[PDB]
């Protein structure tokens, strides 16, 4: 309730300061989906097998 409210204000202060200064003078996301799409293919076969096991149980 105090120090983090102090720091956020100081951020804003610093940024009002330089607000006065400038009045005087594709590849790398593909890689996530391609792994993730395999995972919920792999664990869809896990909860289906668990469903099958539970049904036999």
């Amino acid at each position: 309730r105090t120090l983090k409210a102090i720091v956020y204000l100081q951020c804003c202060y610093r940024r009002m300061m330089a607000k006065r200064e400038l009045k005087k003078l594709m590849n790398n996301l593909e890689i996530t989906y391609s792994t993730e799409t395999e995972k919920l293919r792999s664990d869809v076969e896990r909860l289906r097998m668990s469903e099958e096991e539970a049904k036999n149980a």
Binding site: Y8, C12, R14, A18, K19, E21, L22, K23
Partner: protein, 141 residues
């Protein structure tokens, strides 16, 4: 928009090279309007072109603003500040107390940063500051 922010950038450029020192990236962002940290700035420097660059052009900066727009705009939400010191709820704090919180707590400001700030800030003859007015002035934009 871009006309005020270009005349802005033109006045940061000193040399007239079309590019401004990478150190003064924070100081330009502030001065379009935005309230970010010093840490955010270093985090948005970790892009291979800007990390290797010594100076930045007005295009480059306009892109940096586009790709971090959501983070950058988040910083101009706040209008309310903290206070500590007034326990009795007078609505007022001394200039001494204001300097102490700014220079000794949080992201510690310098005395010269505080002395620049008290040139705009209504201070009575007593030496006290209405902190509700003072928060409105610092967020006024």
């Amino acid at each position: 928009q871009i006309a005020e922010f270009k005349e802005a950038f033109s006045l940061f450029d000193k040399d007239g090279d079309g590019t401004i020192t990478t150190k003064e990236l924070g100081t330009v962002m502030r001065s379009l309007g935005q309230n970010p940290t010093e840490a955010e700035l270093q985090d948005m420097i970790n892009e291979v072109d800007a990390d290797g660059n010594g100076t930045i052009d007005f295009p480059e900066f306009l892109t940096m603003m586009a790709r971090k727009m959501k983070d950058t705009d988040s910083e101009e939400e706040i209008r309310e500040a903290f206070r500590v010191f007034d326990k009795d709820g007078n609505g007022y704090i001394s200039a001494a107390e204001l300097r102490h919180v700014m220079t000794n707590l949080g992201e510690k400001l310098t005395d010269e940063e505080v002395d620049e700030m008290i040139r705009e800030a209504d201070i009575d003859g007593d030496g006290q500051v209405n902190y509700e007015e003072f928060v409105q002035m610092m967020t006024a934009k």
